């Protein structure tokens, strides 16, 4: 019996939009670093719920396990990075994932225009956007203890949407789904994923698991 769902479309802040276009339209040779950025983000999120629980144990009612799961899907061509971290509220998503200017955006673009390696992205605080080196579309599903589950999404192009997620409920955390570009499918390969995690994400302070098939 026909479901009615609310959607809200937002405009990326000007420089974030320019950064996304720079990332998508320019050739870079070390694109694999996108995973290190996403895993670092998940690690950051896990630290936050970890410390918050020390002060309030009920914060783990939504789930005690603190870990990261990597899920490649060769059928629909998606690579999903999941964490049981702190998660983000609707306000968190809208504010921190597009709408508000970030201080390192310009500096990073300057660096890139000068020939800096993309690997540098994390030092500028805009590392999430490196997802667009390999994905044509990114969906961020998230659940924070203080809000309902939400889905953010963008195929770049200057806008992003936010809507309540009606997919599989998550206890708490964030799930980044990368809809990979046709020539970036190597990241759906178990050997390649293991290779890059070993190379760049060896000191993650939480267990990571790769689910194959």
Ligand X SMILES: COC1=C2C[C@@H](C)C[C@H](OC)[C@H](O)[C@@H](C)/C=C(\C)[C@H](OC(N)=O)[C@@H](OC)/C=C\C=C(/C)C(=O)NC(=CC1=O)C2=O
Q: Which positions make up the binding site for ATP?
A: 41, 83, 102, 128
Between strands 68-73 and 173-180, the pairing is: unpaired
Comparing every residue's Cβ against ligand X, the nearest one is 128
Structure tokens at 54: 């020390």
State which residue, 97 or 112, has the beta carbon closest to ligand X. Answer: 97
Give the nearer residue to ligand X in terms of CB position, either 47 or 186.
Answer: 47
Under the criterion CB under 6 A, does residue 165 sit at the interface with ligand X? no
> How are beta strands 173-180 and 78-83 bridged, if at all?
antiparallel
Q: Residue 161 interacts with ligand X (CB under 6 A)? A: no
Phi, psi of 33, rounded to the nearest 5 degrees: -60, -15
SS3 122: helix
Rounded to whole angstroms, how far apart are CA atoms 104 and 145? 29
Considering beta carbons, is residue 97 or 196 the nearer one to ligand X?
97
Whats the size of the chain, residue-wise? 213
- Judge whether 127 and 190 are in contact, CB under 8 Å: no
Distances (CA, A) of 77 to 2, 170, 208: 29, 22, 21
CB-CB contact of 135 with 176 (8 Å): no
The 1-40 site mask, x for binding ligand X (CB under 6 A), equals ----------------------------------------
Min CB(183)–ligand X separation in Å: 24
Site for ligand X in 86-125 (CB under 6 A): 86, 88, 92, 96-97, 125
**Candidates 24-32, 82-90, 160-168, 180-188; binding stretch for ligand X (CB under 6 A):** 82-90
What residues contact 2, with CB distance under 8 A and at least 6 apart?
Answer: none
Contact flag: residue 189 with ligand X (CB under 6 A): no
Instruction: Choose the stretch contacting ligand X; rule: CB under 6 A; options: 2-10, 80-88, 104-112, 188-196.
Output: 80-88
- Would you call 180 helix, strand, or coil by DSSP? strand
Q: Which is nearer to ligand X, 74 or 161 (CB)?
A: 161
Which positions lie near ligand X, rule CB under 6 A? 41-42, 44-45, 48, 83, 85-86, 88, 92, 96-97, 125-129, 140, 174
């Amino acid at each position: 019996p026909m479901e009615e769902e609310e959607v809200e479309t937002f405009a990326f802040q000007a420089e974030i939009a320019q950064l996304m276009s720079l990332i998508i339209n320019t050739f870079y040779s070390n694109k694999e670093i996108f995973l290190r950025e996403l895993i670092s983000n998940s690690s950051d999120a896990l630290d936050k719920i970890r410390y918050e629980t020390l002060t309030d144990p009920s914060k783990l009612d939504s789930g005690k396990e603190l870990h990261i799961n990597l899920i490649p899907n060769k059928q629909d061509r998606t690579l999903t990075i999941v964490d049981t971290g702190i998660g983000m509220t609707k306000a968190d998503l809208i504010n921190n994932l597009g709408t508000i200017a970030k201080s390192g955006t310009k500096a990073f673009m300057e660096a890139l225009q000068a020939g800096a390696d993309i690997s540098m992205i994390g030092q500028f605080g805009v590392g999430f956007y490196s997802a667009y080196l390999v994905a044509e579309k990114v969906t961020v599903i998230t659940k924070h203890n203080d809000d309902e589950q939400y889905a953010w999404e963008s195929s770049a192009g200057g806008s992003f949407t936010v809507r309540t997620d009606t997919g599989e409920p998550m206890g708490r955390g964030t799930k980044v789904i990368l809809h990979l570009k046709e020539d970036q499918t190597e990241y759906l390969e178990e050997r390649r994923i293991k290779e890059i995690v070993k190379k760049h994400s060896q000191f993650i302070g939480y267990p990571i698991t790769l689910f194959v098939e």
